[PDB]
Design a protein around this ligand. Sequence first.
Ligand SMILES: Oc1ccc(-c2cnc3ccc4ccncc4c3c2)cc1
Ligand SMILES: [Cl-]
Length: 342
Amino acid sequence: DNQFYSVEVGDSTFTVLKRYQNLKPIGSGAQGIVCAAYDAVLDRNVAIKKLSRPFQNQTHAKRAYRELVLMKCVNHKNIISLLNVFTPQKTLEEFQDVYLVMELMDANLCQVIQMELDHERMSYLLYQMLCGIKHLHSAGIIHRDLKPSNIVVKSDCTLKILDFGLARTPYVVTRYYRAPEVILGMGYKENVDIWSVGCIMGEMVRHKILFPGRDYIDQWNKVIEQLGTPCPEFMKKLQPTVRNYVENRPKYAGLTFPKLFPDSLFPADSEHNKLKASQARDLLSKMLVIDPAKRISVDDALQHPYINVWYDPAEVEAPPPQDEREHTIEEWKELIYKEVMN
Ligand SMILES: Oc1ccc(-c2cnc3ccc4ccncc4c3c2)cc1
Ligand SMILES: [Cl-]
């Protein structure tokens, strides 16, 4: 009469509570071993992420913990919420897998990005990312790794960020949206995520990853090629070694934003589209700014004409979410186990 049951999903076996049924592979949108499921209890589809032996290595355990802990703690419309967490195992000993249940959206930004550019939709989404991002920031959380695959949205355009990005600190690492200061290993501040949002917004318009690269090298060139070489102030912030490589790169004036994001990528009928196209590029221009010292901030971005319309004080001025010590496998198992056991 066990309350759990195992269901083979893809090459994974999800052993979840009976309430969760019709488990199915989310697909490419799966940020981990995640699958779609129907929560009989809540009569709501949910995404069930499975973490097999999270405590195995260090980094992972730490991240999985931080994630789980934060996800529980945060409660914001644009940050994936934790519908429920559990493990089939009944003891720390037996403990192996952790299943995070969270609302299931209908698509992630990758998908959305491929949709015909709509200003209300793009505007709303962006507003929503800034929001989430703002909430994260207001908690000392600076994502630094915002990407279309880790942001999902419902049909009603509700946008939610899946993970709490990097923690104060490259295989299968979508670096296409990492801010320059990150890529180039410089320090960073909140506006480091504005870059990520710029890349996304631009991509929504261009429909092509703005800065594709087989690695960071190509990326940087694609960056500079389009946004032009950064100012010496930026260079100077570069580690001696890096700065050397970067500064010795081919000098690019960089394409203007009107050219980076032509009018043909935007609606042309209404003057509304004409203005919005202009605002879009404007915003983009303020986000897709190599030098974070010169890059627009979340509040300013939020107050930008393009996002302006959705601005809701209550949402934006929502109070921050209610550690960083290393551990050992055996120690992380407990921490995580307890957290799962609440
Ligand atoms: O085609 C797609 C593309 C993406 C999703 C989708 C929707 N919601 C969610 C919600 C939480 C998630 C947590 C971790 N990984 C993926 C998703 C997820 C994925 C669903 C269908
Ligand atoms: Cl610059």
